[PDB]
Amino acid sequence: ALLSFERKYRVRGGTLIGGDLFDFWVGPFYVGFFGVTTAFFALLGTILIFWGASQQGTFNPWLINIAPPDLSYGLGMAPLMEGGLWQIITI
């Protein structure tokens, strides 16, 4: 569904990368190369947050907490259940 004045603006072109491999709309949303990457990253982060919540023991929105590692780990990678999940979600 389009607005009454919208059709004359929906032309092809103007992409940094991709061409017309991703040049279309899904409902009102515009999709491109960066739409695809946004969907991937956002969905992966949200699902990982909920996996961490299930392993913590609570699904209460006020009480879910995913924390960074201890200071003794420095700038290295921690075990996934002791702070690594936070690093992956940050990326």
Binding site: N65, A67, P68, L71
Partner: protein, 51 residues
């Protein structure tokens, strides 16, 4: 994750208390008392706590 920590400069952590070396230059080991050693009271006229 709670933010409870204490920051410090590394160069400051390597500078000790300057008065530590003064104490070590003015201390000495105790001397184990012998059998019937002379006390300080019998050699001078002093106060009872140190007599």
């Amino acid at each position: 994750g709670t933010g409870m920590s204490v920051p410090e400069f590394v160069s400051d952590l390597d500078t000790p208390d300057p008065t530590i070396e003064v104490f070590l230059a003015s201390t000495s080991d105790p001397v184990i008392p012998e059998e019937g050693a002379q006390t300080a009271g019998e050699a001078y006229e002093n106060v009872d706590p140190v007599l």
